[PDB]
């Protein structure tokens, strides 16, 4: 085992900063490798493949190394390329296309090292492009394949064009013939900003082809990619040439899944750094390679934030560039990209904090500049990206003792209170309060911003002493209050509630009970949990009907209407205790009581949390059934090799079926609600002849888009019913556009 | 297979703290810790209400239950909490991203815990609060003030 880990340490150690020159390390390691080749053939093969698949940010470095070994051995090289091609085949069969891209890139840079003859690579690329000519195949395939080809170009384009420019030109003509007839319906659902200025958010393929065209016009003269093999001239030039076998991409299969299309996130510009190095242009291939390298570095060290920040700060390049802006832009692109970021958002905020720690002299200014820039473009940002921005900002400021120059944003005061900028400011203040106390928010926020600060989080007990005795149930409320101070049992409370004047459901009964209960347990979250759990059988008996569940939700909202966090946590606990099912918490968000608070964040956070709990419950029951089935099968085969369990399996099968049915019903109810509300709004606006684009409509439509983006993985199963019942042709085109975008997202 | 450098996760590793009142040997405690889903959140202020903890640790994923750190006799907060998540992955994410992140201008210390039974929310300290609160000597407004030893 010492041999294997010694080899791994040797191979990995190349690339890191060291006193000796890079060429010396490569030559020395190559010498050690040839010194140990006859006994460690397969070991070094495995290590090289693994490093070709898990270290794209050193893709050049190892490629150079692989040439030196080839210069020392021909059989080694041939077996290495055979291995790599078989690994690529496996990767394409595993539906893991990212490593497929990395492999292709490696092969192309290996072609640069005089290992594989150019014509074979030309044939491989021709097959890739010809994949676009396949019939009745998803466009996300054709897409990925063209993307792999074009992304491989920035590394071996000079060589292939200078060797086979004729076939290259034919291939480019085919690529244009394909790209001119692509479908762009998915772009609006994926753009962070819908505005075309000052930085259009163009699709990744279009931008990549623009970079390729610019590079071609520049005679394939890049200025950023590192090419260590240039110094290794003689050695490599006296190396034999291998030929890759004819490659045929695996045929399309129903179970195959391809990466969904994405949109490049562009928000900076060279004019933003009048002092630093000239930032690469938005259509320069250097900016694509830089973004790709940063993405790989973040994906290779996403576990240790310290190491990730250290790697990002020390990113090497052929020519000096404004690496601070690139890092900030790529991090924000990961955070904001739809449907979901590569990793958990808190990872990105902590990574930014660590990066500021490493480079306090320059990075904080860049972060502040990006913050202001995002604020100034809030008028069109997607609501999902807005939510991510609000969360990030709040947490990130909380870290630095809520110290922002709010006066610089006084503009929100002048414009409409419901406009995106003032709404964002109010939500940020509310979240900041959620991490602090109301007095803190007041003290920090300028006086002129006081109209935006969230309301004080105080309980509103309708049955207070000042409250008039005329309202029914005041005596019952006092009796319940005394009982609560007297540690009364459930039967006592039942007796107390029996003498309530009904105007199997008594809305006044539930109102008085819930009101009193909540009021008494209104000094901390934990007391509220204890009261709900202890007296959860009174809720369960009184809220048998879904109407009762809705009434309990409404009363709970009335009690805590100056504190959204309490709403969220209390409905989370009620749902967990099966006090109210998720459907009831779905029909309560679309109710007329919350119309004034429909666009607030807490409502959508509550909705998302309920969906998440429902999904986790379904997955947990499915996993339990899977474990039971596996145990039954193992016992059966072991006994054979020598009915109660079958009954339990059947029961769990029926339970999982019912859980899936309730999940489906939840999603269907949510979408039906959205459809009804948006249809009514559009009809009213059309009759009034007013502008259809208002902040409320944008918020609602982008929330529907957010639901689709978050839970496409499950809605893929409901696609049929969704298309048959909710999103039909008769529906208004505005609403149907979201469903069409969702369908095109993976087709 | 997979490079061992990438799989390194130094923020989700067991700490050097072993429970002193646990009913069993260290081995079963280690087994439980390797599969637990509960996080002990330390270095909190007495005044910190649980809504903000719920908000923050929900941001790191869904929360199943929260238990505030009550005093042994006064039944008031002592500056520690237990968060019981629904999945192991959420707890790991919270450790990698919530550990060290400020809260009320106070650094939050998150560590694995072997679960929660009755009697686990009252500080083992004979003064009622936390043992560290009885041994520390530095002033801290969020932690009441000088350590119990300083006053008496």
């Amino acid at each position: 085992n010492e041999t294997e880990d010694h080899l791994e340490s040797l191979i990995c150690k190349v690339g890191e900063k060291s006193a000796c020159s890079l060429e010396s390390n490569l030559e020395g390691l190559a010498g050690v490798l040839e010194a140990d080749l006859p006994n460690y053939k397969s070991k070094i093969l495995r290590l090289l493949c693994t490093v070709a698949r898990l270290l794209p940010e050193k893709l050049t470095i190892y490629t150079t190394l692989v040439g030196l070994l080839n210069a020392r051995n021909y059989n080694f090289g041939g077996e290495f390329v055979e291995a790599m091609i078989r690994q690529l085949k496996e990767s394409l069969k595993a539906n893991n296309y990212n490593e497929a891209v990395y492999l292709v890139r490696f092969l192309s840079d290996l072609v640069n090292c005089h290992v594989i003859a150019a014509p074979s690579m030309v044939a491989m690329f021709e097959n890739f492009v010809s994949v676009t000519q396949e019939e009745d195949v998803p466009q996300v395939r054709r897409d990925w394949y063209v993307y792999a080809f074009l992304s491989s170009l920035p590394w071996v384009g000079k060589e292939l064009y200078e060797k086979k420019d004729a076939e290259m030109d034919r291939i480019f003509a085919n690529t244009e013939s394909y790209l001119k007839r692509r479908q762009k319906t998915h772009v609006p659902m994926l753009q962070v900003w819908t505005a075309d200025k000052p930085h259009p958010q163009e699709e990744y393929l279009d931008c990549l082809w623009a970079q390729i065209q610019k590079l071609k016009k520049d005679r394939w003269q890049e200025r950023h990619i590192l090419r260590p093999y240039l110094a290794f001239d003689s050695i490599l030039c006296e190396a034999l040439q291998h030929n890759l076998p004819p490659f045929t991409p695996p045929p399309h299969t129903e179970d195959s899944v391809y990466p969904m299309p994405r949109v490049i996130f562009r928000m900076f510009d060279y004019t933003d750094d009048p002092e630093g190095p000239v930032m690469p242009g938005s259509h320069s291939v250097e900016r694509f390679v830089i973004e790709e390298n940063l993405h790989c570095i973040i994906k290779s060290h996403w576990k240790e934030r310290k190491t990730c920040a250290a790697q990002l700060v020390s990113y090497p390049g052929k020519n000096k560039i404004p690496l601070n802006y690139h890092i900030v832009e790529v991090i924000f692109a990961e955070l904001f990209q739809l449907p979901a970021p590569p990793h958990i958002d808190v990872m990105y905020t902590t990574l930014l904090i660590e990066l500021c720690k490493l480079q306090p002299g320059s990075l904080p200014q860049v972060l502040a500049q990006a913050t202001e820039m995002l604020y100034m473009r809030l008028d069109t940002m997607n609501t999902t990206c807005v939510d991510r921005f609000i969360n990030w900002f709040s947490h990130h400021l909380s870290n630095f003792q809520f110290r922002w120059s709010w006066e610089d944003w006084s503009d929100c005061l002048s414009q409409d209170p419901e406009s995106p900028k003032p709404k964002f400011v109010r939500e940020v203040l509310e979240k900041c309060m959620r991490l602090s106390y109301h007095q803190r928010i007041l003290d920090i926020v300028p006086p002129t911003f006081s109209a935006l600060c969230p309301a004080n989080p105080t309980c509103i007990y309708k049955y207070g002493d000042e409250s008039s005795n005329s309202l029914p149930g005041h005596s019952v409320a006092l009796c319940l209050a005394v009982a609560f101070k007297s540690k009364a049992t459930n039967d006592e409370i039942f007796s107390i509630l029996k003498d309530v004047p009904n105007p199997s459901f008594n809305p006044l009964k539930i109102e008085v009970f819930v009101q009193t209960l909540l009021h008494l347990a209104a000094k901390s979250f934990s007391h509220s949990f204890s009261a709900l759990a202890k007296f959860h059988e009174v809720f369960k008996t009184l809220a048998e009907s879904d109407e009762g569940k809705l009434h309990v939700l409404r009363v709970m909202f009335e009690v805590w209407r100056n504190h959204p966090q309490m709403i969220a946590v209390l409905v989370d606990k009620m749902i967990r205790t099966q006090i109210v099912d998720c459907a009831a918490v779905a029909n309560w968000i679309f109710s007329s009581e919350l119309s004034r608070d429909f666009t607030r964040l807490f409502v959508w956070e509550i909705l998302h949390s309920t969906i998440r709990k429902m999904n986790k419950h379904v997955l947990k029951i499915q996993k339990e059934l899977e474990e039971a089935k596996e145990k039954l099968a193992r016992q059966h085969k072991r006994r054979s090799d020598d009915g109660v369990l079958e009954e339990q399996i059947e029961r769990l099968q029926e339970k999982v079926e019912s859980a899936q049915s309730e999940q489906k019903n939840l999603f269907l109810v949510i979408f039906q609600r959205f459809i009804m509300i948006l249809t009514e709004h559009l009809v009213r606006c059309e009759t009034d002849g007013t502008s259809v684009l208002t902040p409320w409509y944008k918020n609602c439509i982008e929330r529907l888009q957010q639901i689709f983006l978050q839970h496409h993985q499950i809605i893929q199963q409901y696609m049929v019913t969704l298309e048959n019942l909710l999103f039909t042709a008769e529906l208004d085109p505005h609403i149907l556009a979201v469903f069409q975008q969702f369908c095109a997202l993976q087709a | 297979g997979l490079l061992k450098a990438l799989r390194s996760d130094s923020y989700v590793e067991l700490s050097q703290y072993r429970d002193q009142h646990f009913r069993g040997d260290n081995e079963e405690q280690e087994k439980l810790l390797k599969k637990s889903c509960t996080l002990y959140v330390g270095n909190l202020s007495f005044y910190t209400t649980e809504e903000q903890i719920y908000e923050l640790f929900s941001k790191s994923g869904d929360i199943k239950k929260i238990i505030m750190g009550l005093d042994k006799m006064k039944k008031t907060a002592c500056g520690f909490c237990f968060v019981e998540y629904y999945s192991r992955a959420d707890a790991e994410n919270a450790m990698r991203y919530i550990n060290g992140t400020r809260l009320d201008d106070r650094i939050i210390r998150t560590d694995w815990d072997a679960g929660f039974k009755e009697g686990r929310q009252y500080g083992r300290g004979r003064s009622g609060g936390q043992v560290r609160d009885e041994y520390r000597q530095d002033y801290d407004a969020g932690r009441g003030g000088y350590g119990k030893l300083a006053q008496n």
């Binding site: 540690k487 | 202020s45 007495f46 209400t49």
Partner: peptide, 21 residues
Amino acid sequence: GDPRAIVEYRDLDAPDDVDFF
């Protein structure tokens, strides 16, 4: 000066609580 009194969970009777859902 934290302008909020510490909460008192004195009788937060938590008997047996599980998540039925």
